Design a protein around this ligand. Sequence first.
Ligand SMILES: N[C@@H](CCC(=O)N[C@@H](CS)C(=O)NCC(=O)O)C(=O)O
Ligand SMILES: N[C@@H](CCC(=O)N[C@@H](CS)C(=O)NCC(=O)O)C(=O)O
Lengths: 219, 219
Amino acid sequence: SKPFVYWGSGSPPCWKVLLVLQEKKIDYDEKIISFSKKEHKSEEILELNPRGQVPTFTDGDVVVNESTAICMYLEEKYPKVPLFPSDTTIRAKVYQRMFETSNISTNVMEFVQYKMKNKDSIDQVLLKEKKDKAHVELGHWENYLKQTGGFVATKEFTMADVFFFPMVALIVRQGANLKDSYPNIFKYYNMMMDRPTIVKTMPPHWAESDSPGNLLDLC
Amino acid sequence: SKPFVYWGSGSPPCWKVLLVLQEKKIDYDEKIISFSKKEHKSEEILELNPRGQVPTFTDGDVVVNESTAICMYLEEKYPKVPLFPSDTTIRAKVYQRMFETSNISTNVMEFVQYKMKNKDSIDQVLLKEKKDKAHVELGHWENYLKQTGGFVATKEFTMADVFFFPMVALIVRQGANLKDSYPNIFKYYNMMMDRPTIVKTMPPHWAESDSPGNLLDLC
Ligand SMILES: N[C@@H](CCC(=O)N[C@@H](CS)C(=O)NCC(=O)O)C(=O)O
Ligand SMILES: N[C@@H](CCC(=O)N[C@@H](CS)C(=O)NCC(=O)O)C(=O)O
């Protein structure tokens, strides 16, 4: 049995899956679909995933789509390279950080959404509201990296970094100068960006396209 | 070591934790906080949870807050009553359903949010948009229950039902007549509502308060 994963460029849910696969060094087959050409809605994809989304994934008769379910399945199916420590108490912290990352999406990426959605309708009395929420959110993670001095959950790479980093990258892709404002996250970013597995899974379309820059003002 | 959980009434994240605790029959200590009196922001809560949210949870030196992390920790710490089957392939389906339930929140509960948020500003040209999304979302789950004939993920109660049911209940609490429109979800609801563990964890404030009814029109 050899895993197969349909995924697109610039998608954190897909990145999570690719990182897990690479980090555990599992040989897999893939189909890099085009979002702009709506390939995530192909019939081939819909048979496996009624929601027409990526990642979509198989491994024999095993079919799983939620990026988080795929990662959990991979951790359980291919145990040789653990992305979780063995200590139950410490694993709890890894799980905490993993799932807590859904907050970045809401409190951070909302800042970008707003400027794009209701554009031309810029209300700085509200703009400064969500901007402060983004910073409040990032502060938590900043403190976390500060607290460990290394990776988002512990002093080693774990499933939590698989969830967190893609979000950090997307933030920087939007142009966040975190160098001085969030020295720990930035230190974490540059550190991670240097990890082989991450260099290998950078979103394909990023190199030859310009940053959306919806965050150039962040900090 | 005895678990301690701070939680509030009518909160799906808290319900998930209570169900897991009850279903595995773990004896725990609790603090039922008042949201209206802002007790989720107490100092006692903030020391353990910098976000000032519930559930907030401890078990010795073990501190975990994300409802999903707590459930995973409980599954791993107290294995006697498994909420997951042993088959790795089948567990994958349980994980799929568990995490996919985050969609109900977005595609379903948005319908309720909108009518509350931008109220008085009712735009039925858009109202009928999200209403159709709610039905599309529920259809997936309807088909799932149809596909199994029993619980949301398999023919037994699993961690997936722990995630799904609270959302179904909240929907009905908003007044959804799913009897004829979603016979399988409704059958699932009445079935679940009858399970001892669920009767015991119904949101405390529901009995003596009226349904918000933001869904009475759903179907
Ligand atoms: N909860 C899913 C979400 C996946 C998702 O949102 N995928 C996007 C790309 S990042 C997609 O394919 N979207 C297409 C759509 O909604 O049609 C996960 O984490 O896997
Ligand atoms: N992702 C968390 C979310 C918890 C959450 O949103 N809790 C709400 C009650 S349902 C809360 O305490 N909210 C207070 C707040 O944001 O201040 C989880 O699932 O545990």
